Amino acid sequence: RSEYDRGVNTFSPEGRLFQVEYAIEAIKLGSTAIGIQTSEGVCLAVEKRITSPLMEPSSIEKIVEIDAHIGCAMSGLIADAKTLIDKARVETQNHWFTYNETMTVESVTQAVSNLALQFGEEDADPGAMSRPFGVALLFGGVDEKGPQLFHMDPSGTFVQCDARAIGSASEGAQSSLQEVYHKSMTLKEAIKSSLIILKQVMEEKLNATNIELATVQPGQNFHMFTKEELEEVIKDI
């Protein structure tokens, strides 16, 4: 750092962009979210990390529905994620409105990235988004190509990932994922694998309240709020 971090406008003598890197750091404050993409479908798992018994579990939204075929998991600032999540929800519906078809997971990730990129364009909606967003979004959906999982980052950079981890314990989760992931993994096998990795990397015991799971598969729709099966899958493992 050493100065040159005052704005995304300034460039480092090294040529690095500070502030964009600082926003990448904000994701670490987030709870870990693990997504695995398999031929049967894409599985998303998250650590709810409920702060108090009194607070309602539903209000913390770590896994949200962008559309019937697409689901998203967010690690990072809650408010920033909401602006990006709304754009993805409007865009999937607008693509349906203009083209009478379901938007591909990659195209939604690209569309969301376009707003994320405008950290400081200086032309678009002036007085809005003067800083980089601090949220990393995992988009898991089944499109015409097939099940696809895409990771976006605060810098507008997106990639297709067979398995990925975001948030605190992402680094630990990725190392575990490389050992566990294989091309022929079934969605059921992947769902068990994701929670096993989540249990190892979360300090609290993996009780049903602690973990929220989601799965999108070609035959069914979003189906990304397994409810009371959170207890069933955990007990079997």
Binding site: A26, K28, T51, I60, K62, L77, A169, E171, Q200, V201
Partner: protein, 377 residues
């Protein structure tokens, strides 16, 4: 009052006891010979002359004395530029004096070996590797460097956040150096007399030159005048002269020759530019806050001695430590044992460390470590 009287009576009894209690051939023949034996004050010869030698000697603060050789001496044995002992009464060089050892400089040499292996230092493989080829491999196997015709850096500066492990690595090099290690006392170099410390720095290099291949560790370089504001007040003038004397002896007009210098500073920015310039110190090995693999390794090494359940996950504990120096990771391990001692459980459990992780980092006023803000999840 009666209890106070008992103590007063006890004191009176002690007073009665004290009052009642009240109611080698070297010291023989040798002393009679020893008292007549004369003294020979030390002095340093500067020159010699033809015919009567008339060697002229500066006593050490007194005067240039034209003293003839003593009758019972060999003229050849007395030499120009040799310390000698001159009797005050006979005003002659009764016996020559061996060269001054200058023990304070000798004391700084480590002599003993600190018992720390490189294995104990953890999470800095790259920093260890950089030190190995400026400290151990060039000295142990100079042939490889010669084959590429590449000289070793011959200088190293270790800088990093406090508690990173810079000194721990240095003691580890001392354990396996196989060459003289000269730890330097920074306060010793500063001295009451003007430039007295600068004289010591010349001696430090002279001692280093006499030994073959040696490493000098200037820990806390900031103490050795590692800045050159050199303002008009010149409060640091005596130290600034000491710093410059180190710089010239280090490099310029024939440098270390066989001396490798290791300098460790918590604040690198304060160091004077001339010292920072390479040649004096070619390598710049900055130690860095350990990454998650390093944080797990430091936890494992520190906790290996402690008795704990075999199922503890250091990876989770290291993850919970976002930016922790090695000393703070050691502080978590010791604190976790202290909580088990408080509850009197001989074998500690994962929970004890988590309480310590909160205590060592979050409980300290880091503020970032303790979260009251919902802001991000």
């Amino acid at each position: 009052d009666d209890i106070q009287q008992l103590l007063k009576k006890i004191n009176e009894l002690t007073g009665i006891k004290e009052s009642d209690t009240g109611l080698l051939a070297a010291d023989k023949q040798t002393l009679q010979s020893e008292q007549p034996l004369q003294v020979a004050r030390c002095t340093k010869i500067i020159n010699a002359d033809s015919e009567d030698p008339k060697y002229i000697i500066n006593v050490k603060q007194f005067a240039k004395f034209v003293v003839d050789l003593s009758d019972q001496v060999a003229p050849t044995d007395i030499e120009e530029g040799m310390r000698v002992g001159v009797d005050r009464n006979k005003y002659q060089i009764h016996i020559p004096l061996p060269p001054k050892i200058d023990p304070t400089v000798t004391m700084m040499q480590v002599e003993e070996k600190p018992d720390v292996t490189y294995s104990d230092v953890g999470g800095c493989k790259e920093q260890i590797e950089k030190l190995r080829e400026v400290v151990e491999t060039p000295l142990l196997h100079p042939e490889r460097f010669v084959n590429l015709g590449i000289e070793p850096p011959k200088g190293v500066l270790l800088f990093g956040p406090p508690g990173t492990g810079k000194t721990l690595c240095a003691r580890a090099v001392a354990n396996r150096t196989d060459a003289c290690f000269i730890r330097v006392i920074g306060s010793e170099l500063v001295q009451k007399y003007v430039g007295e410390g600068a004289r010591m720095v010349r001696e430090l290099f002279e001692m280093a030159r006499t030994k073959k291949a040696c490493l000098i560790f200037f820990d806390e370089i900031d103490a050795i005048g590692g800045a050159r504001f050199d303002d008009g007040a010149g409060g640091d003038n005596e130290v600034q002269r000491t710093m410059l004397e180190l710089i010239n002896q280090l490099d310029g007009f024939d440098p270390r020759g066989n001396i490798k210098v290791l300098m460790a500073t918590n604040r690198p920015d304060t160091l004077d530019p001339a010292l920072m310039r390479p040649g004096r110190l070619d390598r710049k090995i900055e130690f860095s806050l350990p990454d998650l693999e390093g944080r797990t390794h430091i936890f494992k090494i520190h906790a290996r001695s402690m008795s704990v359940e075999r199922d503890i996950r250091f990876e989770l504990l290291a993850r919970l430590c976002p930016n922790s120096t090695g000393a703070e990771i050691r502080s978590v391990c010791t604190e976790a044992g202290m909580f088990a001692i408080r509850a009197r459980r001989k074998i500690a459990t994962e929970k004890d460390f988590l309480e310590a992780v909160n205590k060592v980092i979050k409980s300290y006023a880091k503020f970032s470590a303790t979260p009251r803000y919902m802001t991000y999840n």
